[PDB]
Amino acid sequence: DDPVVQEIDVYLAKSLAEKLYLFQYPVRPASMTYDDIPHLSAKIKPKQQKVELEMAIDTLNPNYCRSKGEQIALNVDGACADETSTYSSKLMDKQTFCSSQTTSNTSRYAAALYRQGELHLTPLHGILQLRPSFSYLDKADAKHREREAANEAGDSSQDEAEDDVKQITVRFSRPESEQARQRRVQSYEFLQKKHAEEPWVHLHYYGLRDSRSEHERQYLLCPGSSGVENTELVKSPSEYLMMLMPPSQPSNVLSMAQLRTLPLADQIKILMKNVKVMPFANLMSLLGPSIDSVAVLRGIQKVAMLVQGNWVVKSDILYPKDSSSPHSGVPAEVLCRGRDFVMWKFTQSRWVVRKEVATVTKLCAEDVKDFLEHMAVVRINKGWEFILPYDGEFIKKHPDVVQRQHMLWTGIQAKLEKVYNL
Amino acid sequence: TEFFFHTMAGREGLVDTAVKTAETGYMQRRLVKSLEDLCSQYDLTVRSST
């Protein structure tokens, strides 16, 4: 699936980055538009964007009830007050559309203008949903309340001058508890008052049919060459994945990745502690081909010994100086001596008798069994055999390491003959 | 799957018996408390306590 056709370019424009708004009418289908509806004004605020459109609707059309219009006009306003009237005439002529804010940040939204072979993107400063507001009914209810108050006052034809002098009811500015102060701050009335504190800005309306629309429509484009290598947007896929997914911040506890994050010496030590028997090629494969063989060899020479061409972890590594036998409680030095004797017997001969080791080392059956299971398997009619076969390739490749391990085993054999009186 | 279905059937039977025990206990209590008054007289007529 190759990109056969339609290799469209993408351009970016910053001319209307702060002046582009998206108005969507959730109650008006796309078929009917407001192009023919003459608009009158638009109130708006720069901060805390909430636009209120004030448009005009016809009356002589058959789809308008003049009687109900007169009724609603008499209900919302007074008889002939006209000082603050929601409608200039005696009919419902103006309609109010109020905007609700969809989201706070609109950086991820963009308007795309498509031309032949190009697509121009322009960021959106804000997105608002315009719905028909019902605000004249609130003023109608307030006027009905004041008319009820007037009717209450008019119970008598002539009202005597009431001695309703306003006694000084200056209330204490009580120190408000922090909880009650937070409740007042989080109250809806406080938020509405804070929103109303910002002054309104009046704007005129220019329809799509206006020449100014087609005049300013060209600002969504940008002057630039067809082929230009962008200086930015050059990060690798790994860097992009790290950007869009930022991080939050037994002895086999550490995993393979946590192992590879550790230095090479720690990796070799942990691997020899976990497996305790492994060839050199397997260690090179596990650590990785990007690591030099000499460094791995130097690291394994400090935590392992050579037995029949294979590598067996040292006794002190498995048993620290403060550890003890989980089965008998003997000190770790005796366990190290016994394991060294077992490894020496394995270097001398491939077959090791469990009873002979138990007699020489004077240890219990479970400790000898644990020592043998770490590096041997049970072969019927033959005793215990080393789990890995004789690896002569590593011996032929590194004779100096073989000689070093041979003299080390000679020293260990001298120590064992001194201790156990072999 | 067959073992799970068999265990489902067994548990259904167990809960059925568990409900049946208490339900029939209450029914037996009511029936005996209502019917304990009748007795066969010597004139071959079954009469109540009154």
Binding site: - | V19, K20, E23, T24, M27, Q28, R30, L31
Partner: protein
Amino acid sequence: PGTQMTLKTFHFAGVASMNITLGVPRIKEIINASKAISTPIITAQLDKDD
């Protein structure tokens, strides 16, 4: 027999439908003499049954 009754199912009485309460719930509804019972059944005979 209430304890002996298993409260079985699938006993549609030959019509393979019209789930009717039978068993301990049925005996309870009978002995309670309730005016309104669950799943009432009325059997009507026809003059021309053929």
